[PDB]
Design a protein around this motif. Structure first.
Motif, PDB file in Angstrom:
ATOM      1  N   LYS A  33       4.091 -14.111  -7.309  1.00 55.56           N
ATOM      2  CA  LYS A  33       3.526 -15.278  -7.987  1.00 55.56           C
ATOM      3  C   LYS A  33       2.788 -16.190  -7.006  1.00 55.56           C
ATOM      4  N   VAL A  34       1.824 -16.957  -7.504  1.00 58.46           N
ATOM      5  CA  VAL A  34       1.061 -17.844  -6.637  1.00 58.46           C
ATOM      6  C   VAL A  34       1.738 -19.187  -6.371  1.00 58.46           C
ATOM      7  N   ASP A  35       1.549 -19.693  -5.153  1.00 60.72           N
ATOM      8  CA  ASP A  35       2.061 -20.997  -4.744  1.00 60.72           C
ATOM      9  C   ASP A  35       1.463 -21.388  -3.402  1.00 60.72           C
ATOM     10  N   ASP A  36       1.347 -22.691  -3.198  1.00 59.90           N
ATOM     11  CA  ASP A  36       0.745 -23.262  -2.003  1.00 59.90           C
ATOM     12  C   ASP A  36       1.168 -22.733  -0.623  1.00 59.90           C
ATOM     13  N   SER A  37       2.358 -22.148  -0.502  1.00 61.98           N
ATOM     14  CA  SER A  37       2.805 -21.644   0.793  1.00 61.98           C
ATOM     15  C   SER A  37       2.119 -20.347   1.224  1.00 61.98           C
ATOM     16  N   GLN A  38       1.813 -19.477   0.271  1.00 59.60           N
ATOM     17  CA  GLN A  38       1.168 -18.202   0.575  1.00 59.60           C
ATOM     18  C   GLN A  38      -0.272 -18.367   1.044  1.00 59.60           C
ATOM     19  N   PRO A  39      -0.847 -17.309   1.639  1.00 62.51           N
ATOM     20  CA  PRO A  39      -2.240 -17.421   2.088  1.00 62.51           C
ATOM     21  C   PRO A  39      -3.146 -17.578   0.848  1.00 62.51           C
ATOM     22  N   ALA A  40      -4.297 -18.217   1.014  1.00 62.69           N
ATOM     23  CA  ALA A  40      -5.211 -18.435  -0.105  1.00 62.69           C
ATOM     24  C   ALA A  40      -5.714 -17.156  -0.741  1.00 62.69           C
ATOM     25  N   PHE A  41      -6.198 -16.221   0.072  1.00 62.11           N
ATOM     26  CA  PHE A  41      -6.715 -14.993  -0.506  1.00 62.11           C
ATOM     27  C   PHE A  41      -5.608 -14.306  -1.311  1.00 62.11           C
ATOM     28  N   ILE A  42      -4.356 -14.492  -0.890  1.00 59.59           N
ATOM     29  CA  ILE A  42      -3.212 -13.906  -1.590  1.00 59.59           C
ATOM     30  C   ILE A  42      -3.019 -14.485  -2.999  1.00 59.59           C
ATOM     31  N   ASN A  43      -3.238 -15.789  -3.161  1.00 57.87           N
ATOM     32  CA  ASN A  43      -3.096 -16.399  -4.488  1.00 57.87           C
ATOM     33  C   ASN A  43      -4.282 -16.013  -5.363  1.00 57.87           C
ATOM     34  N   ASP A  44      -5.441 -15.803  -4.750  1.00 57.90           N
ATOM     35  CA  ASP A  44      -6.586 -15.443  -5.554  1.00 57.90           C
ATOM     36  C   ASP A  44      -6.429 -14.048  -6.115  1.00 57.90           C
ATOM     37  N   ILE A  45      -5.818 -13.153  -5.351  1.00 62.57           N
ATOM     38  CA  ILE A  45      -5.617 -11.797  -5.831  1.00 62.57           C
ATOM     39  C   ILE A  45      -4.615 -11.791  -6.987  1.00 62.57           C
ATOM     40  N   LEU A  46      -3.503 -12.500  -6.834  1.00 58.78           N
ATOM     41  CA  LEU A  46      -2.499 -12.568  -7.894  1.00 58.78           C
ATOM     42  C   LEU A  46      -3.049 -13.098  -9.227  1.00 58.78           C
ATOM     43  N   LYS A  47      -3.982 -14.043  -9.158  1.00 58.91           N
ATOM     44  CA  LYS A  47      -4.581 -14.623 -10.351  1.00 58.91           C
ATOM     45  C   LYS A  47      -5.464 -13.614 -11.089  1.00 58.91           C
ATOM     46  N   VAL A  48      -5.704 -12.463 -10.468  1.00 54.26           N
ATOM     47  CA  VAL A  48      -6.511 -11.415 -11.085  1.00 54.26           C
ATOM     48  C   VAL A  48      -5.719 -10.757 -12.206  1.00 54.26           C
ATOM     49  N   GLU A  49      -6.303 -10.746 -13.400  1.00 52.62           N
ATOM     50  CA  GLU A  49      -5.691 -10.158 -14.591  1.00 52.62           C
ATOM     51  C   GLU A  49      -5.381  -8.689 -14.350  1.00 52.62           C
ATOM     52  N   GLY A  50      -4.096  -8.354 -14.340  1.00 53.09           N
ATOM     53  CA  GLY A  50      -3.710  -6.975 -14.121  1.00 53.09           C
ATOM     54  C   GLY A  50      -2.921  -6.760 -12.845  1.00 53.09           C
ATOM     55  N   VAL A  51      -3.042  -7.688 -11.906  1.00 55.37           N
ATOM     56  CA  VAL A  51      -2.303  -7.574 -10.665  1.00 55.37           C
ATOM     57  C   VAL A  51      -0.861  -7.960 -10.939  1.00 55.37           C
ATOM     58  N   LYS A  52       0.064  -7.093 -10.550  1.00 54.27           N
ATOM     59  CA  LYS A  52       1.483  -7.355 -10.761  1.00 54.27           C
ATOM     60  C   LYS A  52       2.121  -8.000  -9.523  1.00 54.27           C
ATOM     61  N   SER A  53       1.992  -7.353  -8.368  1.00 53.91           N
ATOM     62  CA  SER A  53       2.558  -7.890  -7.134  1.00 53.91           C
ATOM     63  C   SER A  53       1.718  -7.442  -5.953  1.00 53.91           C
ATOM     64  N   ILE A  54       2.062  -7.953  -4.774  1.00 54.20           N
ATOM     65  CA  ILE A  54       1.350  -7.619  -3.545  1.00 54.20           C
ATOM     66  C   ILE A  54       2.311  -7.415  -2.383  1.00 54.20           C
ATOM     67  N   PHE A  55       2.184  -6.285  -1.700  1.00 57.88           N
ATOM     68  CA  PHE A  55       3.012  -6.005  -0.534  1.00 57.88           C
ATOM     69  C   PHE A  55       2.070  -6.175   0.640  1.00 57.88           C
ATOM     70  N   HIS A  56       2.399  -7.097   1.540  1.00 54.19           N
ATOM     71  CA  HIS A  56       1.558  -7.377   2.696  1.00 54.19           C
ATOM     72  C   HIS A  56       2.288  -7.152   4.014  1.00 54.19           C
ATOM     73  N   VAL A  57       1.768  -6.248   4.842  1.00 53.23           N
ATOM     74  CA  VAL A  57       2.397  -5.959   6.130  1.00 53.23           C
ATOM     75  C   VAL A  57       1.434  -5.317   7.116  1.00 53.23           C
ATOM     76  N   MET A  58       1.477  -5.744   8.372  1.00 50.83           N
ATOM     77  CA  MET A  58       0.595  -5.180   9.383  1.00 50.83           C
ATOM     78  C   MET A  58      -0.887  -5.448   9.055  1.00 50.83           C
ATOM     79  N   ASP A  59      -1.683  -4.389   8.909  1.00 53.18           N
ATOM     80  CA  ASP A  59      -3.120  -4.513   8.623  1.00 53.18           C
ATOM     81  C   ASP A  59      -3.517  -4.108   7.202  1.00 53.18           C
ATOM     82  N   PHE A  60      -2.600  -4.233   6.245  1.00 51.56           N
ATOM     83  CA  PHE A  60      -2.919  -3.830   4.874  1.00 51.56           C
ATOM     84  C   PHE A  60      -2.052  -4.469   3.806  1.00 51.56           C
TER      85      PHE A  60
END
Length: 83
Positions: A33-60
């Motif tokens: 879910k989106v919230d001010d603590s996460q990176p900006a590009f991360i909240n923009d991706i979540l707001k995309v209709e259809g995106v369920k979650s995001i796993f972020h680690v290393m370079d991907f």
């Protein structure tokens, strides 16, 4: 920030997107879910209709879509975030 590679994963509702800028820490983060603590590009991706979650680690980031959604419509909006 630029996407250097987009691939298929052993699963269907998830795709591995490799970015140029790598992560500083060695730990991972899973954003559902989106919230001010996460990176900006991360909240923009979540707001995309259809995106369920995001796993972020290393370079991907591994993006998970909704079971009812299709990548043909989600992926472009996802890449549109990096402009």
């Amino acid at each position: 920030m630029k996407i250097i590679s987009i691939s298929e994963t052993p699963n269907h509702n998830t795709m591995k997107i490799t970015l140029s800028e790598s992560r500083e820490g060695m730990t991972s983060d899973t954003y559902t879910k989106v919230d001010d603590s996460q990176p900006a590009f991360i909240n923009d991706i979540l707001k995309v209709e259809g995106v369920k979650s995001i796993f972020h680690v290393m370079d991907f980031i591994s993006v998970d879509k909704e079971n009812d959604a299709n990548w043909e419509t989600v992926l472009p909006k996802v890449e549109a975030v990096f402009e």
